[PDB]
Design a protein around this ligand. Structure first.
Ligand SMILES: O=C(O)CCCCOc1ccc(C2=C(c3ccc(O)cc3)[C@@H]3C[C@@H](S(=O)(=O)Oc4cccc(Cl)c4)[C@H]2O3)cc1
Ligand SMILES: O=C(O)CCCCOc1ccc(C2=C(c3ccc(O)cc3)[C@@H]3C[C@@H](S(=O)(=O)Oc4cccc(Cl)c4)[C@H]2O3)cc1
Ligand SMILES: O=C(O)CCCCOc1ccc(C2=C(c3ccc(O)cc3)[C@@H]3C[C@@H](S(=O)(=O)Oc4cccc(Cl)c4)[C@H]2O3)cc1
Ligand SMILES: O=C(O)CCCCOc1ccc(C2=C(c3ccc(O)cc3)[C@@H]3C[C@@H](S(=O)(=O)Oc4cccc(Cl)c4)[C@H]2O3)cc1
Lengths: 228, 9, 218, 8
């Protein structure tokens, strides 16, 4: 396992190079503005994002050391969380809007088009506002997204011991980034806590999101099937 | 499983 | 507010002093759900008094206090249950006279899955040698953080973080061991959030106070 | 709400 041998800078550059691209949504002027077309637009978007996410997870240091069964388990538990923190990160520079795609920028008013989605829209907007106030850096974001992948399914399975040591290495990487940014020792621990507490909210948004999803893409049906 | 196959390729 | 001006030891002693007591249960799938519902109903009354004594909580308005408790109540019950069960591996000590294993959890439909998650959290706390001073800090964090996204609260969260680090530094942990342990504890809170959400979904699928705490999530 | 009265 070369994940534990990586330095902090090597861990950051590895995570940055693994980043998936920003995908575009379908732009069909024939489709009407409705709940079915909006959901079809979001479903089609997340469906193509999942293919890139699976390829991204292979490049997360330590992930390929896990058995195939555990890799499947981690992705099933965390896929919506990872889509959400990506959405929240893309929406930082757009206050009051969610950039689902460069050609799909939505505010909370348009989120009312689907029944019950505006509550989750408001939670995603507040999380995006929290990142903007903290001035979340890209190097911190890629660490947080890898933490979600490794942590969200670790207590629902020896293999747990390896994941925990990789998670500690990512913690060392976050501290290295903050100490490199001039923060004091006190500010480092405080910011580390603020970032990790947001992951509790991202988990909350995913669970509330999944709950509405398996009530109303064959790959998504299987990912959605794992949480029920 | 689709996720199982994509992780193998 | 007064909470910001507290020192680390004064913050620790205030939280330990506000600890609610360990209650007993009353001396079938319905028989167990009644026992758990009755126990959680009496614990909520003690939870409200505890929340009043968490530094910084009374500085919030009445509406924001209600919001944080409605969001966090099952999370707070669960981390208390997990803390009580640390010294009883493989078992969940709901009450001193109600100690259950995962097999008994199968008596209620769909509860064994949440039981296994609770047991895994308790084993994790045990293997980390979670201390009482650390536990009360984590429980206060859950109260203030779980509903903050739905600036004074963030200033209090920082103070609790400084208190956690102070406890680890006083125990002899290096700087690296301090921030590593801090991260480990906070990532567990995400699983406690997950367990609460799954527990709530099952609760409004099946007390006068519960109903309103349960209704806030629907 | 019951939580309103208990917090008073
Ligand atoms: O930016 C975009 C991207 C896609 C569209 C789409 C379309 C369109 C219809 C007529 C037209 O002249 C041009 C486009 C149609 C309708 C929507 S939709 O309801 O599916 O979803 C939405 C998308 C954005 C805003 C809202 Cl409120 C809903 C989608 O397909 C609209 C805006
Ligand atoms: O946000 C918006 C803005 C405008 C609409 C409108 C509509 C609508 C119809 C039914 C419905 O239930 C909701 C909306 C209809 C169609 C559009 S439109 O053709 O003017 O062009 C656009 C308008 C906005 C964005 C884009 Cl990309 C194109 C407009 O009137 C919808 C959402
Ligand atoms: C199927 O597949 C889907 C469908 C919709 C999504 C969505 C999104 C998304 C986020 C990031 C991203 O990169 C792409 C999409 C965001 C987040 C979720 S959500 O929490 O609103 O859940 C709900 C979904 C539908 C109805 C309701 Cl009531 C809730 C939803 O909007 C995701 C997967
Ligand atoms: O309709 C009404 O009026 C009554 C509604 C209010 C009931 O109120 C309840 C009921 C049960 C609990 C429980 C616990 C608890 C933990 C710590 C503690 O100190 C006290 C209780 C632990 C954790 C939850 S659980 O997630 O496993 O939930 C389920 C349990 C079994 C089956 C299913 Cl489907 C879900 C449960 O066991 C809590 C509150």
């Amino acid at each position: 396992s070369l994940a534990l041998s990586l330095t902090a800078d090597q861990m950051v550059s590895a995570l940055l190079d693994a980043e998936p691209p920003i995908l575009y949504s379908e732009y069909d002027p024939t489709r009407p503005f409705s709940e079915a077309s909006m959901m079809g637009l979001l479903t089609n978007l997340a469906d193509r994002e999942l293919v890139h996410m699976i390829n991204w997870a292979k490049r997360v240091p330590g992930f390929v050391d896990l058995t195939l069964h555990d890799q499947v388990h981690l992705l099933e538990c965390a896929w919506l969380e990872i889509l959400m923190i990506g959405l929240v990160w893309r929406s930082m520079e757009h206050p009051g809007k969610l950039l689902f795609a460069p050609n799909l920028l939505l505010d909370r008013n348009q989120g009312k088009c689907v029944e019950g989605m505006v509550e989750i829209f408001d939670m995603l907007l507040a999380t995006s506002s929290r990142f903007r106030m903290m001035n979340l850096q890209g190097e911190e974001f890629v660490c947080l997204k890898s933490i979600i992948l490794l942590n969200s399914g670790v207590y629902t399975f020896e293999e747990k011991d390896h994941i925990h040591r990789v998670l500690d290495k990512i913690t060392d990487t976050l501290i290295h980034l903050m100490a490199k940014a001039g923060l004091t020792l006190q500010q480092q621990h405080q910011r580390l806590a603020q970032l990790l507490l947001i992951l509790s909210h991202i988990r909350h948004m995913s669970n509330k999101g999944m709950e509405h999803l398996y009530s109303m893409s064959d790959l998504l049906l299987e990912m959605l099937d794992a949480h029920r | 499983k689709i996720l199982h196959r994509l992780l193998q390729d």
